[PDB]
C-alpha cells in the first residue's frame with residue numbers, strides 16, 4: 058500500500074547553516090507524525106547540501122559497448138585500494154538547466170562524445186539520511202568507436218581518461234568490485250536488466 | 261587494463277576539519293598524477309565525513325518476499341513528494357564492529373527480524389565526489405510472515421514501520437520511482453538479477 062505519511066504530516070520549523078563554503082551543511086529543525094498516532098518533539102538533523110546531479114550511461118547499442126570515465130575521487134581514498142574510480146559521465150545541475158542538457162555537456166567535456174537518443178533510467182537519492190543529493194540517470198546512445206583519450210576541463214583541475222568496455226565486461230567489473238560507486242552500479246545493473254529491449258529499440 | 265594510478269600516485273598534503281558536530285566536513289588538500297604526465301598542483305576538496313554503513317536486504321526465499329522499513333528522511337523533502345521513504349535495514353558501523361554484526365543488530369532493532377544466513381551483495385561509495393561514505397550490503401534470510409509492526413529506537417527519535425511485499429512488487433516500485441534511495445535500488449536490482457539462484461541455494 059506504500060508509505061504512510063505525506064508533507065501534510067511534517068513541518069520544517071527552520072534550517073540553520075552550520076557551514077557555508079563550496080557546499081553547505083544545514084541543520085534541519087522539524088516535527089513529524091509518529092506511526093503510533095502522536096507527534097514527535099523537535100528533531101534536528103545535519104544535512105549535507107551539495108546540489109543535484111545528472112548522470113549519463115553512454116551505451117553503444119550496435120557494438121554492445123559502454124564508455125566509462127576514470128578520474129581521482131579523493132574521498133574514496135580511505136576505504137578503497139585506489140582513489141581513481143571508473144564512473145559514468147556526470148555533473149551538477151545548475152539553476153535553469155535540464156538533466157539532459159547537463160548530460161550532453163558533460164559527455165562532450167568528459168569523454169569527447171556526442172549523444173543521440175536518450176531514455177531515463179532512474180533518479181535516486183544518494184544517501185538520504187545525511188545528504189539531500191538526488192542524481193538523475195539517463196542512458197544515451199553513443200558510437201563507442203569515437204570515445205577515447207584524455208578529457209576533462211584542466212582549468213577546473215579535471216583530468217579524465219576514457220575507457221571502452223563491452224557491456225558484459227562492465228557488469229563483470231561491478232560484480233568483482235572494480236566498479237563500486239552508486240551511479241555506475243545502478244546504471245549498469247539497470248542495463249543488465251534492460252539491454253535486450255533497449256538494443257532492439259535502438260537498432 | 262583497469263585504473264591507471266594507485267595510492268603511490270597521490271600525495272595528501274593535509275586534511276582540515278572545517279565543521280564538526282554530529283558529522284564532519286573536512287577539507288582535503290592534495291596533489292596527484294596526471295594522465296598526460298606530471299603532477300597536478302595543489303587541489304582542495306570539501307568532503308562530508310559521516311562514517312560508513314551496513315545495509316541488509318531482508319529476503320524470504322520461501323515466499324519470494326522482501327521486508328521494507330519506512331521512516332522519515334528529512335533530506336528527501338526538497339526533491340520528493342514525501343520524505344517518508346521505503347528502505348533497507350541499515351545502520352552506521354562503529355569501531356570494531358563487522359558489517360554482518362551491524363546488519364543483524366539493525367534487523368532486530370528496525371524490523372523485529374531474526375536473520376538466518378547472509379551473503380554479500382556489493383559494497384559501494386554513495387557519492388564519492390563529495391562524501392567518503394561507503395555502504396556494504398548483505399542479503400539476509402528472513403521469515404517475512406514474522407515481519408510486522410512499529411520499531412526503531414525511540415531514544416534516538418527513530419520511528420520505523422515494517423512493510424512486507426513480493427519481490428516483484430518491490431522491484432516494480434524501483435522501476436516506478438516509488439523506491440528511489442541508492443541502497444534499496446542497488447539491493448533490489450541485485451535481487452532481480454540473482455533471486456532464482458538465491459532461492460535455490462536457501463531452500464535446499
Ligand SMILES: Nc1ncnc2c1ncn2[C@@H]1O[C@H](COP(=O)(O)OP(=O)(O)OC[C@H]2O[C@H](O)[C@H](O)[C@@H]2O)[C@@H](O)[C@H]1O
Pocket residue numbers: 101102103104184185186187188282313350351352393395416417418
Ligand atoms: N543527519 C543526521 N543528523 C543528526 N543525527 C543523525 C543524522 N542521521 C542520523 N542521526 C542520528 O543517528 C541515529 C541513527 O541514524 P538513522 O536515523 O538510523 O540513519 P541510518 O543509521 O539508517 O543511516 C545509515 C545509512 O542509511 C541512510 O540513508 C544514511 O544516509 C546512511 O547511508 C538516529 O537516531 C539519529 O539520532
Ligand SMILES: Nc1ncnc2c1ncn2[C@@H]1O[C@H](COP(=O)(O)OP(=O)(O)OC[C@H]2O[C@H](O)[C@H](O)[C@@H]2O)[C@@H](O)[C@H]1O
Pocket residue numbers: 079110112144146147148149192213214215240304305306307387388389390
Ligand atoms: N567536493 C568538492 N569540493 C570542492 N570543489 C568540488 C568538489 N566536487 C567538485 N568540485 C568542483 O566542481 C567541478 C565539477 O563538479 P561536479 O559538477 O560535481 O562534477 P562531478 O562529476 O564531481 O559531480 C557529478 C557527480 O557525478 C558522479 O556521479 C559523482 O557522484 C559526482 O559527484 C570540479 O571542477 C571541481 O573543481
Ligand SMILES: [Mg+2]
Pocket residue numbers: 146147148163167
Ligand atoms: Mg563529472
Ligand SMILES: [Mg+2]
Pocket residue numbers: 147148163166167215
Ligand atoms: Mg565534468
Ligand SMILES: [Mg+2]
Pocket residue numbers: 349350351366370
Ligand atoms: Mg537505520
Ligand SMILES: [Mg+2]
Pocket residue numbers: 350351366369370418
Ligand atoms: Mg537503526
